[PDB]
Structures are given as structure tokens and as C-alpha cells.
Design a protein around this nucleic acid. Structure first.
Lengths: 180, 124, 262
RNA sequence: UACCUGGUUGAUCCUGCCAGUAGCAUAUGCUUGUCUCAAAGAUUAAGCCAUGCAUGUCUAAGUACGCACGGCCGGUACAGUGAAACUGCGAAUGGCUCAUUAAAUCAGUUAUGGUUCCUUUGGUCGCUCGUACUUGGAUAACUGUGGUAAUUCU
RNA sequence: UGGUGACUCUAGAUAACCUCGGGCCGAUCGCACGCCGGCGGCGACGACCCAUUCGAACGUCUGCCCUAUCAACUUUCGAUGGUAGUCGCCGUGCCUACCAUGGUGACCACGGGUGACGGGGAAUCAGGGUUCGAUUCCGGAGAGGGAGCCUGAGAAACGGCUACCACAUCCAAGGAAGGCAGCAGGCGCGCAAAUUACCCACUCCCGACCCGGGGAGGUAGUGACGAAAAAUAACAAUACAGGACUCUUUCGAGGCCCUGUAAUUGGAAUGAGUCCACUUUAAAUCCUUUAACGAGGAUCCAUUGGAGGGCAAGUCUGGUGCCAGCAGCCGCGGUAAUUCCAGCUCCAAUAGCGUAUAUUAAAGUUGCUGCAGUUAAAAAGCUCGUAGUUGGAUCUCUCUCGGCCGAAGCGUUUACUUUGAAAAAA
């Protein structure tokens, strides 16, 4: 007997057909457009979207006044509009089935750093976040997969210790200054 | 900037004769503040001696902003020596642990198990 | 398998204790006492987890062995002492008195009472029997025996006990129209007025209860504890008045409170 | 994501299986920079085991004429600390393994009005019509004499 | 007296009895003060009896894998029942004496098998299912195999004893001593699994106990079982390439945007690593934090399988020549080999990928949903017939005491449906 917890789960699904040309092209389009590292990030976002769709599809078979349908559907919709994937105007259970993978990929911190102009390209945004240059509110965030909530969008600064936003030159600049 | 101390979840525990609190330490560009400096700061903040203030469990947040730990200010030093874990006392030089390892004690006990009477004192 | 067990696994401990799953393998196995193992709260859980006066079980021992804790007027130095329903926990050093009343979620709430109300308690009588040359005895849910009870007190009634003397000062009969709290099952912690009792000879009687907000539920006869006469409770109720809120109502109330205060 | 594809023929439509395809769990091969959580002698051998450890325990409150320490007046009965030993409690919990086991174990349900219950908790405990200002004998620890190659022997 | 649905319950009364191996009514200890030889307050410990606190034990109802190449089984060795007892803590063929001849079975008894401990549960799964569950929670069982016991509230206990069987140890051969399916570790087995480490600081447990102990448990070491996050580069100037959601009689200005083995050049960014002080923690045992150094082939160099089809991606070049080999399947190879051995290039996943085996989906190839039986595998030669399965139409407030309901009762029963109660957590 141990005080440890063995609860864990896989966060992606490997596709059934490994060599579908259209699937490969679409996944490469997503990777290139959003600057992802491998197909596992695409499959992870696919898995989260599939689980959300599955919950919505199950809740849509219940009666429209079933208290569990009301509670759980309202919670799911509030969560979906919290991270900005779903517009609050479209807050019915049937609009969850209309969401795409790119809506969830848009909310990534990599995409948001690229969009807010802190980076010149999406890959630059990835290397920026991974190099402790980007902070959300007051917290330095190293994870490009960080899904930014709506209330957190307005606060994505350039860190208070990063050379680009905080005012301490890095190793390269300091060495070049010491050369002269 | 300089180091700042706040005490989040302050409580007065009369049952152990102390005040227990959660300590937030703002050190925006420094290493995690040594426990001794935090103890001096708490002594200044609470108008007492830093010898009745025991602080522990300090975790620094990712990114280097602040540190969060627990602290306890005792009513007196004897109440501290009575209510404190021995290791937190030894961190102040008020307690010294035994030198022998577990193995030595266990083998000595089993050796004495094989003799009867005052000869037990003659083992080891 | 031979003789009694002395350990309680953390995941096998009662859920209403609200214990973690990563703080060790074991849970405090409550000592034998007035209340059942699953229907109690060890003193260590109350002092360390609820009141948070102690950070570890060793500090609970340090508190208890100073004799700062009394339960039903008696100084208890056992950190696994089972304190159960209606029990009064007195801490004279901090001058605070608690009563163990179930929260609507079926958990022991940290409920503070006045020193005037800490002088008594309510006890559900479990049996009445005549013994030992005609002396009638009454046994309550505290497993405490009282000789010479009032002849009108029968089983399932509720007696008020003066803790200092332990003698019955008053009682409420188990009758339709008397306030009661549910002490077991799904309706645990709910408070309402008794409205019906369908008797099933040879099996469990079912008591119907109507909540102050109009909600009606049912329970077994062994799960009813009469609090007061009529709609008026004889003890101070917890923060919630025994009215269970649906999860939708709970979410709405939480959101409204957040909007109102912050 | 309620999915199929190659293969019998000169060619065709089928039956039908083989092969592919994805997860999962063991072993293995090649390769491996960071960080978190985490399984791990189950399968074959419930096969065999060197060595060490894994169960002991004293409060103001059972028994202290061990100076083994110890001082305050020390023929103050017992200052006190305290090894040993007698006494009490525990050692029936925990941990391991899955050999046996097919209404057996087990699960849910119910019963003990058909039983036992250390401990905890609350009661009862002058209810008995005939030296008590305190009775008896051992025995450990301790001292001393040994036996056996050998033991937690005596 | 009181209670239950129900006592041969509880309480009461009477005549007695009370185990040589009789049972209850305290010869016990500490701390504080106290008033006439007074009377005392606060505890500790110990009896007896009652009170499911914790249980244990033993019963009820329903549910358990394959097998008929197992169809009858049990009744001397109690089988089913009845009466009296014995034993047991108690109910009971638990055992005994006597009597009866019963009890189970195609609704699968009995026997056999099980790489069978049961369940919570796990993998997979549209719906339906199929496999798995030694494994940390609950229950059971065992401590080499059997058997028998002591002590005790509790054990048929094995880190208790007694004996036999198997194995094995020391011996001065007279004797003595064993039990890792506890934690490490060793041998053996095998395709198959880690350190003879630190600590009781946490969680709890035990004890006379605030103090002692705990290979329970924690903490580290080994760790590509597995799971999560996530580097191996970003930007710009400079050939050039193309378009041109920009301007012009093809032309061209393409910095008006986006690529590009360019080992071009340029400055920025940073962590892998080494190191320092903290912090962590029982003990720096990592992560986090600060600081020093730390990238141009950023040599600080990503691999594992493939390139005919299935199936993504070369009938390019060199070698071999039905050889060597490849190839899950179809197939390649006998002188242009799209398939072998290699170079280059390409693509799939990527700190991971290939292989063997078991299993799930695929499998509507086990079909309840949901398959088939003229000829592809398949309807018995034919009829009768007991279990089994299925079975035509019909049939439109239950009385009381207290005559506002504060209040009733027996209304033919089942299945079905809805509800309610109760139902460990993980």
C-alpha cells in the first residue's frame, strides 16, 4: 500500500488509417498554420474537441427540461465561452457541434502571442514562450499550449525580466558589450 | 526592489501558545530569501524577538516572483521548546539529535535480547 | 481475520470526513465509544482538519494532553475519540463551544454554540427496559444509560440532557408535526417537520418529512432524530437551516453572492 | 468517426477465409536531451534460502535497601534519576502471496426472538443479619557455587 | 410494571440448589489542602452485571466459467426427515441411539477440467457485446506439506509450541537448532521484474505511554511498464525563385507579402550542461529561485521503419543474377531487380519507433440487436411424441374510534412500468 495516486490518462488518439492522403494534408496544414511540433498536438486538440462533442451529443438526447441536461449543458457552455472558443451569443447545446479544431487552436498561447504582435511569426512566438519571455498577467508561462481565457487575453505582456520587456540584456548582448 | 513580507492566513492558536500564519515573500529579482532574514522581518513586523519565530515550507513560484511558506510565532521560548518539532528546534541550534544510526540501535537491541539481567548493560 | 482490526485505510475511511488521498495510507481509526465508526468524527479530524488548530497529528496530541478539550462536559485525551451527533465540544482555553450537527451535504459542520447552549444536548432514546427489581432504564444514541426516566418517554423520542448532571430535563415525543433531522441515508442532514409514518411490521418503518421550503422526502425510522416540538428546534441550527438546495440553486446562489460581495 | 483494403479468374459477380489496419498488455531490438506523476520476481518454482532488520512498551499515579548515578540534616521508612527483574498490556493488527477453493469463497439483501464479545462509553457496585490503623507464604532482580563443544539451556 | 408483528422477553412471586477444578460485596497507587482521636476534595488502577462501540460466528433470498466422449447421484463412511440426548458460545445429523425411506436431477443433478481466489474494477466497444481482474480497496485462504494444541476476549497463530513427512544447519556425534508467500539481498526458474540504502519528519498503529517502538509507512537509488508537459532553433540584410486579394503598349518596377542543402553575413534570444548561495527536507535527496560561465557546422550533429500494391514515399545509380536474400499477403530475384546488398533522394511517426505473443474492434466470419442451410459449408429418410418454446376473439371512494379531515382498511394475486427507501470509498 502506497499513498500515491495512479490516476492518469492519455490525451490523444492515433488515427485508424495511418496513411490517408487527405488526413495527412489537413494535419500538415494545421501544423504549419499554428506552428505545432508534431501530429500529436493536432490529435490532442482533436481529442478534446471529440470529448466535448460527445458530451454535447449525449446531452442533446435528454429532455430539454431535464435538470441534469440543464446543469451540465450550462456548465459546458460556460466553459466553452470562458476560453473564447464559443461566442456567448451562440450559447445553445446545438452550437457545440458546430465548433472546429481551429477554434481551439486559436486560443493557444503561441497563437495569441503571434496575434497580439509580440512575435513576428508563429514559430518566433513558440520560441518566445519557451524562452521565458512571455507572461500572462503576473505569471511567466513557458507552455505554448496554454489555452488563454477571455478574461486573460487583455493581460499578455512581455515579462518584467525579459530583455524585450523588462530591461536586462541577455548573455549574448552582455558578452558583446564586454568585447569592446 | 526589496524583499516584502505579508502574512495571509493569520490565526491565534492559544491551544499551542502561538500565532500561525502563511507568509508571502516578494523578492522580484533575488534568490529565495533565507529563513533567517524572513524571521528578522517577521520579528520587526510583530514586535517580538526572532528567536520565537519558526518558518518553514517555503516554495518559490515558477517565474521567480514570490515565495510562500508557513510561520509560527510563539508566546515565549519555553513554549516554543515545548510545542515545537525537534527538527525545527535543531534548525535554530536548540536541540541535538542522537548520533547512532538505525542499524546500530536495532542490532544492539537484538544483541541485548540474547542476555538476561544486568548483562544487558554489558552488550555494546 | 483473527480478532479485531486496528487500522483504517484512507480510502476506506468515511467520505464525510473529507480526507485527502495523498496524505498517507491510513486514516485515524476512531476508538470504540458512544458513536459508531462510520457515524462519528475523531477528535484528531475535528481539531486538525476542521478547526486547523494543529498542523499534524502530533500537535493534536499536544493539544489534547493539555486537557484543553472536553466532549459532553468530560475532558477527553484520546485523539481518536468518536464525537458524534449532538455532541458538545468545549474548549475553555479559547472559550468556544461547538455542537456536531450534520451539514446538508451529510458532513459534520463546524457549528459554534453559545456557552448557555453548551450546557445541554439532545439524545434519541434507543430502548426502554425494566430491570433490576423494577427500575426502568432508558438507553439513548450516546449508549448512555439513564435510570428512572419519565414514564411517558418511549422509544424514538428525544430527551434533553443536562450535561453536568446527565439527567433528563425535558423530552419531545416522536409524533407527527415535530421537527426532525435525518441522521442517515441520502437525506442525511436535512431538517423538516414529520408528516407521516407508514408502519411495516417485521421490517423498517418509513417516516415522511416535509422541509420548511415545502420539499418532501422519506427515510427509515432509524434515521429520524426529533430536534424540537412543532416547527421550533430546541438547538441552534447550522448555517444552512437543513434546507437542501438543488445543484442549480447552489450554483445560482454562489454566483449571486460573488456578484453581490466579491 | 456506426469506415474497410490486397489475394482464387483469360476476365466477371459471389461465398469464404488468409493478409493488412487501429487500440491494449507482457517480453525484446535499435535510439534517448529536459521536466512531472508513476508500475516493478504475478505468470515458470505457494521452489530453496547465507546475512541484517521487520514488536515491543512506564506515567504524578503497580513492585526500587543495584551508590549504576545522586544531595538538601542523612540511625529521617520511602529525597530524586534510573539499568535490571517481577507485574500489566500488546504480540490475533499490519505486511506478503494467490496454492487451495465452482452455491464453496464472494456480492447485494436480510436474520440472530439462535450466540460470543478484550477495549471504549454510560449505568449498577453498604441491596446479603454477624488484625481492618491493613493479614499469609513464595519468588525474581541482586550476592554466591556450578554443568554442557553448543542455544534467548539452565 | 415495561416491550415486540410475534417470546417460552423483561420485571415480580414461591420451594430449593450453588461445582474441592464456588462468584459478586476494593487489604491497591498519586496529588493538594483541610476543623477535637474525626470526617473529606481531585484523580490513577482493579472486580461483577447490564447496555451490537468494535467485531466474530452462523443462517435467508438471488446471482458463478467450460464439459454429456459425465445421466443418474446420496443411503456400510448420515444420505433426507422425525424423537431423545451428546458436544458446541449458540441454531443444526454437528455427533450418537431409535424410528421413517427419504433427499437431488435435462429448469443439467453427480462427475471431470480450470495457465479459477470472489467482488469494487480494467482494455476495447455506435447500439448490442467480447476478453481480462495475482496486483495497493473490501471479503477469503495460507505461511514447506499435513495434523494436534497452549495462552488468551480473540489463533487451530506459525517473526507461538508438539509430532510426522520433505529439505536443510552446528556437533567435541552425547546432542542442539530450523521455516523470507515481511523489507532488502542470494540461488534456481524462466521471454519476463529494482537497493543487503536513509528515517520515524508525515499517515497512522501499538504500549504503563505528551516521552518508547514500528523494513507498517516515508524518503531517496535502479526505471523508455506506462502517463502528462516539452528543446534540437528564431529574426534580418544579401543571389535567386515564383505568384502578384500592387502599378504598366508583352515587357518590367517584383524590399508591395510569402519559400528557398545559400555549410553567406549579421547581430539578438535561450536552455542542456558545469558551478554558487538560498529554498526543499528528519538529513540540500530533486523541482523551483538568484548569480557566474555556457551556441554558427549553433559537431550542443534524432532516431526507428520503409519507398511495386495493400499504404505515404524513386521502373535513379552501382553490385548480385532463381544465388544471396526480400516478402505479414499478392509477389521480387534466372543480366534495364520500381521489391535483395548499397549510395543519393524521398515519407511516416518522432524522443521515440520496429518485432514476437495474448486480447478488443475490424467480425453482420458466432449474428439477442444481426448471419446462413436449392446449386458456394449446411434441412434429420419419414411420422408420432414427453419436458422446453409459443399459443385466436371476447368482460367499461376496503366499513374506525373524534359526525371540517385534523383521519381510516384490507382491498384476488403476479409479471410489467413509474416512484420512494436503503445501498463502501477508490
Amino acid at each position: 500500500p502506497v499513498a500515491r495516486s495512479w490516476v492518469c490518462r492519455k490525451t490523444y488518439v492515433t488515427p485508424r488509417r495511418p496513411f490517408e492522403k487527405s488526413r495527412l494534408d489537413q494535419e500538415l496544414k494545421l501544423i504549419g498554420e499554428y506552428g505545432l511540433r508534431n501530429k500529436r498536438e493536432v490529435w490532442r486538440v482533436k481529442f478534446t474537441l471529440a470529448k466535448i462533442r460527445k458530451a454535447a451529443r449525449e446531452l442533446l438526447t435528454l429532455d430539454e427540461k431535464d435538470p441534469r441536461r440543464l446543469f451540465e449543458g450550462n456548465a459546458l457552455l460556460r466553459r466553452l465561452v470562458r476560453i473564447g472558443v464559443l461566442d456567448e451569443g451562440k450559447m445553445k447545446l446545438d452550437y457545440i457541434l458546430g465548433l472546429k479544431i481551429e477554434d481551439f487552436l486559436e486560443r493557444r498561447l503561441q497563437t495569441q502571442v503571434f496575434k497580439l504582435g509580440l512575435a513576428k511569426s508563429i514559430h518566433h512566438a513558440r520560441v518566445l514562450i519557451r524562452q521565458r519571455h512571455i507572461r500572462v498577467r503576473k505569471q511567466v508561462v513557458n507552455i505554448p499550449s496554454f489555452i488563454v481565457r477571455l478574461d486573460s487575453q487583455k493581460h499578455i505582456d512581455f515579462s518584467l525580466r525579459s530583455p524585450y520587456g523588462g530591461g536586462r540584456p541577455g548573455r549574448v548582448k552582455r558578452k558583446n558589450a564586454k568585447k569592446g | 526592489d526589496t524583499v516584502t513580507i505579508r502574512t495571509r492566513k493569520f490565526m491565534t492558536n492559544r491551544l499551542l501558545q502561538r500565532k500561525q500564519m502563511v507568509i508571502d515573500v516578494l523578492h522580484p529579482g533575488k534568490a529565495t530569501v533565507p529563513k533567517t532574514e524572513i524571521r528578522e522581518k517577521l520579528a520587526k513586523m510583530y514586535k517580538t524577538t526572532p528567536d520565537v519565530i519558526f518558518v518553514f515550507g517555503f516554495r518559490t513560484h515558477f517565474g521567480g516572483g514570490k515565495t510562500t511558506g508557513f510561520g509560527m510565532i510563539y508566546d515565549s521560548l519555553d513554549y516554543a521548546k515545548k510545542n515545537e518539532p525537534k527538527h525545527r528546534l535543531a534548525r535554530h541550534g536548540l536541540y541535538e539529535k542522537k548520533k547512532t544510526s538505525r542499524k546500530q540501535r536495532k542490532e544492539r537491541k537484538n544483541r541485548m535480547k540474547k542476555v538476561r539481567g544486568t548483562a544487558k548493560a554489558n552488550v555494546g | 481475520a483473527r480478532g479485531p482490526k486496528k487500522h483504517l485505510k484512507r480510502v476506506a475511511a468515511p467520505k464525510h470526513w473529507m480526507l485527502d488521498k495523498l496524505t498517507g495510507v491510513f486514516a485515524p481509526r476512531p476508538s470504540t465509544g458512544p458513536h459508531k465508526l462510520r457515524e462519528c468524527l475523531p477528535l484528531i479530524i475535528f481539531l486538525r482538519n476542521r478547526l486547523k488548530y494543529a498542523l499534524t497529528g502530533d500537535e493534536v496530541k499536544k493539544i489534547c494532553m493539555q486537557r484543553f478539550i472536553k466532549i459532553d462536559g468530560k475532558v477527553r485525551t484520546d485523539i481518536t475519540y468518536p464525537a458524534g451527533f449532538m455532541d458538545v465540544i468545549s474548549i475553555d482555553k479559547t472559550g468556544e463551544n461547538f455542537r456536531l450537527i450534520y451539514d446538508t451535504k451529510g458532513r459534520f459542520a463546524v457549528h459554534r454554540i453559545t456557552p448557555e447552549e453548551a450546557k445541554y444536548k439532545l439524545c434519541k432514546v434507543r430502548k426502554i427496559f425494566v430491570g433490576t427489581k423494577g427500575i426502568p432504564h432508558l438507553v439513548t444514541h450516546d449508549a448512555r444509560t439513564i435510570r428512572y426516566p419519565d414514564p411517558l418517554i418511549k422509544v424514538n423520542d428525544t430527551i434533553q440532557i443536562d450535561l453536568e448532571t446527565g439527567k433528563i430535563t425535558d423530552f419531545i415525543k416522536f409524533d407527527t408535526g415535530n421537527l426532525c433531522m435525518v441522521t442517515g441515508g441520502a437525506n442525511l442532514g436535512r431538517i423538516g417537520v414529520i408528516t407521516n409514518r407508514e408502519r411495516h411490521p417485521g421490517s423498517f418503518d418509513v417516516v415522511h418529512v416535509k422541509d420548511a421550503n415545502g420539499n418532501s422526502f422519506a427515510t427509515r425510522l432509524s434515521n429520524i432524530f426529533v430536534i424540537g416540538k412543532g416547527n421550533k428546534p430546541w438547538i441552534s441550527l447550522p448555517r444552512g437551516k437543513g434546507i437542501r438546495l438543488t445543484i442549480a440553486e447552489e450554483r445560482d446562489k454562489r454566483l449571486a453572492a460573488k456578484q453581490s460581495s466579491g
